[PDB]
């Protein structure tokens, strides 16, 4: 895990609220969320490396992340 747990935990809980105020998680649940979040963001950045190496564009842009989302399909 390359993300510190406490700040991520606050974000998860504040998201948890806006759906329904009454809602609770647990240590090992929120750690599952984080494990996925890191794996997903890393996946996303490996795609951005594919552009850079093939085009002439080493500095990564928001466009590339957007693209890497579209190929996977929860922009779909």
């Amino acid at each position: 895990l390359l993300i510190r747990k406490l700040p991520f935990q606050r974000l998860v809980r504040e998201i948890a609220q806006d759906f329904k105020t009454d809602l609770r998680f647990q240590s090992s649940a929120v750690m599952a969320l984080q494990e996925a979040s890191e794996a997903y963001l890393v996946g996303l950045f490996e795609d951005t490396n594919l552009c850079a190496i093939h085009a002439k564009r080493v500095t990564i842009m928001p466009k590339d992340i957007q693209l890497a989302r579209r190929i996977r399909g929860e922009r779909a």
Partner: protein
Amino acid sequence: MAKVQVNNVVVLDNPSPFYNPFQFEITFECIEDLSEDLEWKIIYVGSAESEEYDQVLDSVLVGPVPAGRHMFVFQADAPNPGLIPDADAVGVTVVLITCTYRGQEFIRVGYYVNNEYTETELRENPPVKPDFSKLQRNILASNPRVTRFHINWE
């Protein structure tokens, strides 16, 4: 439970001029006989900004689909450049192969596509309006992204 399994996709006549059709050799398998429809499509992502610039290039609607292993060459015409934003025309976007059962997408095969000019003048001094008749399309065939989605096969 997953009634259709896609085994392989091969990108053909690649690289090629932008105006060439896409050609994918798709190999897939049925487990039960299929009753409801099976719909394949190729989507060209015109612009990362927004889904509004997707061009659905073709759609093969097939059914009922016998059990076993089948194969076909999915050809589809190049996108309409009239509709591609300038900024996005050159560089990297994405093509998608998609397959649907009973109107539910269950697999998405995607490739990055790099469109570059061939002539070093055009590479160096790229025109203000993209000249599509001089763009070469290079699909990154070695880096597919196959995403499966659990769907109701009932």
